[PDB]
Design a binder for these strands. Structure first.
Length: 50
DNA sequence: ATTGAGGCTGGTCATGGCGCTCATAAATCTGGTATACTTACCCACATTGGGGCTGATTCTG
């Protein structure tokens, strides 16, 4: 019953949801790249690798 | 009742198979990713409790 309360998608809905996911991921990526501590941790990890 | 020897009490010198410990290594055990399209399973009794009536005392239009 709980599963059938919802209706399946189509190709257009799948494309729209994928686009929304990509947009959210891009926004999160921009927000986390806008900080310098990310670059600091990247450099520290690269130094540890080297 | 002594002093002359055997049997038996003290320690020598390694000795030798056994057991714990180190290290190698291939077999065994774990985590991980696959892109034509696949969308709702398969007997008979006795007792107590819950729900729908059934009046029967209280109030009503």
């Amino acid at each position: 019953r709980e599963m059938g309360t919802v209706e399946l998608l189509t190709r257009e809905g799948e494309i729209d949801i994928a686009k929304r996911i990509e947009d959210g991921i891009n926004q999160v990526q921009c927000s986390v790249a806008e900080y310098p501590e990310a670059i600091t941790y990247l450099l520290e990890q690269y130094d540890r690798v080297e």
